[PDB]
Amino acid sequence: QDELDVVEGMQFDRGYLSPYFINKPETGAVELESPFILLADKKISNIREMLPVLEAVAKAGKPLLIIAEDVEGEALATLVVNTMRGIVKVAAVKAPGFGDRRKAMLQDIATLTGGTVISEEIGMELEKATLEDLGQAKRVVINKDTTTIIDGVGEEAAIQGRVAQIRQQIEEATSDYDREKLQ
Amino acid sequence: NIRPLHDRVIVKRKEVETKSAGGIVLTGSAAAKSTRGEVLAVGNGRILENGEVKPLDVKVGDIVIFNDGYGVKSEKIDNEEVLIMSESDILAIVEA
Amino acid sequence: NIRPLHDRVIVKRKEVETKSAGGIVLTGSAAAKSTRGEVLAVGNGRILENGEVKPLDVKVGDIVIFNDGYGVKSEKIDNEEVLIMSESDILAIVEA
Amino acid sequence: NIRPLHDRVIVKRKEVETKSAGGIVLTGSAAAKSTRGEVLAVGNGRILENGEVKPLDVKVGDIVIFNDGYGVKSEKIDNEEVLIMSESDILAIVEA
Amino acid sequence: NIRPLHDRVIVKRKEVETKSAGGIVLTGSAAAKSTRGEVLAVGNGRILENGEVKPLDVKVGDIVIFNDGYGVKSEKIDNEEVLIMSESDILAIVEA
Secondary structure (H helix, E strand, O other): OOOOOOOOOEOOOOOEOOHHHOOEOOOOEEEEEOOEEEEEOOOEOOOOOOHHHHHHHHHHOOOEEEEEOOEOHHHHHHHHHHHHHOOOOEEEEEOOOOOOOHHHHHHHHHHHHOOOEEOOOOOOOHHHOOOOOOEEEEEEEEOOOOEEEEEEOOOHHHHHHHHHHHHHHHHHOOOHHHHHHHO | OEOOOOOEEEEEEOOOOOEOOOOOEOOHHHOOOOOEEEEEEEOOOEEOOOOOEEOOOOOOOOEEEEOOOOOOEEEEEOOEEEEEEEOOOEEEEEOO | OEEEOOOEEEEEEOOOOOEOOOOOEOOHHHOOOOOEEEEEEEOOOEEOOOOOEEOOOOOOOOEEEEOOOOOOEEEEEOOEEEEEEEOOOEEEEEOO | OEOOOOOEEEEEEOOOOOEOOOOOEOOHHHOOOOOEEEEEEEOOOEEOOOOOEEOOOOOOOOEEEEOOOOOOEEEEEOOEEEEEEEOOOEEEEEOO | OOOOOOOEEEEEEOOOOOEOOOOOEOOHHHOOOOOEEEEEEEOOOEEOOOOOEEOOOOOOOOEEEEOOOOOOEEEEEOOEEEEEEEOOOEEEEEOO
16 A cells, blocks of 8 residues: 655654664664754764763753764763763764765754754864753654654744755755755 | 882872763773872882982872873782882872 | 972963964964963972982962973863973973 | 073074075075074073082073074964073074 | 892792682783792892992892893793893882
C-alpha cells in the first residue's frame, strides 16, 4: 500500500554519535525535554573548550543537545560518562550536510532555536560560550537515523527573514539540485 | 621505609581530580595526572662545591607542586606508587 | 596559597589585548598571549655555590615581562591560571 | 618605563639603511635588519658566583652592536619595538 | 674483589619479582628488571673542586634504588652480574 510519512520542523538525517546517549532504551532513542542546543561549526575532540558550557548547563539543570561537525575521543567519552552519572543529560550529534551547506543548515537551526553558531570565522570561542548563546527548543528526539527538534524557541520574525533569504537564494539559483536543497 | 639522598625528595602524587570545578566528571586525558603530591621523606640536603650539606626547603608531610620529566622516577613502596625527584624538580610546596 | 622556591616566581599572566592601539579588535593569533604578568609570590632567593640565599630582585604585586618556554610551567590555583618560572626567565619588572 | 634585570639591556634597534653607500635604494633582504641599536635602559649588573652585582659596561643612550638570536627577545613599549638581551649578546657599544 | 673509584658504587641487582602481590606469576616484560640492588662495595668518595674527597652516603650491604641508564655499566665478577654506577645515579638506599 502507498504510505505517507510527514515530518514537521527539522528532521535532518544525523543520529546520536554514541549509542549510550539513549535516554529511553525500549525506543532506542534520546528524548530531551526543553533542552539547550549548542551549535558548533568546528569539530571537537577535547572537553576543555566546552567545560564552561557543560558546567553552566549542569547548573541550569535542563538537558543539552550538541550539533557539531564531529564529537569524538575525550570529549565524546566525557559527555557520555556524564550522561550516565546524571549531572547533565547531554546528547551529541553530527552537524547536517557538508561544506558550504553545513554552515547554512547550522544557521537555520540557530534561527529556529533562538541560538548562535559558534565558529572560528565568526570570532567567538567555545570557552566563552554562555547559556544565552546556547539555543532553546521545547523537545528533541534523536535516533540512530535522524535528529528532530520540536518547537524551537526562536523569533518568528527571524525565522521568516531566514526563509525569505533562502527564497532569494532559490531565485538566484540556476541548478535543480541547488534549488531543491534550498527548498 | 625509604628516605632519599642528597637534594632529593620522595613524593606521593595526589589522586587526579575525578570531577571538574562545576561538577563535570573528567575522564581519560581530562583527568590528567596531578602535579601536586605530599612529601613522604626529605633528603639530608644538597651538597655544595665546598663539601657542606645544605638542608632542603621541603619538609615531610607538605604538599608540593612537582614537574614530571626525566628527573622524576617512579617507584613502588609497600605496593604504593611514589615518585623520587630532586628538590630543583619540586616547583613549590603548597600551604593552606 | 602558593609561594615559590629558591630563585622562582609565581606570575599571573595579564589578559591578552582584545583591541589594537587604533581600536581594531584582535582575534586568534592577533591576540597573542601576553608576556607581561603580575607577580603573586616571590621565592626565598637563588642559592649560590657558597650556600647563601640571595633575595630576588622581583617583588610581589609588580608586573613583569616573562619569556614563555620550557622553564615556565602552567598551574591552576583557586581555579585560576598562573605560571611558575625562575627569576632568570623573568625578563624585566614593569614600573609605571 | 621598562628597565632590565641583572646583566641585561633594553635596546631600540636602529632603522634599516634605506639606501646603500653609493645611493642605491635597498629593498627586501637588501635592507637587512640593523644589528646596531641605542641603549634605552641598563640592568643593575650581572651576578657573580659570590653574590655580588657587577655593573655592566653598557650605558644608557649609547649605540651598541647586538647579535640577533635566541637570547634576544622582541617586546613592545609605548607601541614601539624594542629588544631585550644580555650584555654578553651585546657585541660592542659604538662611539663616535 | 672489586671496589669502585671516586663517587661510584658496585651494586648487585635484586632478582626480579617472579610473582605479583596477589600471587600472579609475572613473565617477560611483566617481570621487569628490579631497580633495587644491594651495595657490594663503596668508593672512596666524590672529589670536590677543592681537591678533598667526601665519603659517600651509601654503605656496603644496604639495598639501594638505582636508575638504569647510560651511567650504569654492566660487569661480571666471579661469574655474577653486577652494576657500576655513580652515587648520583643511586636514587635511594632502602632501610627496613
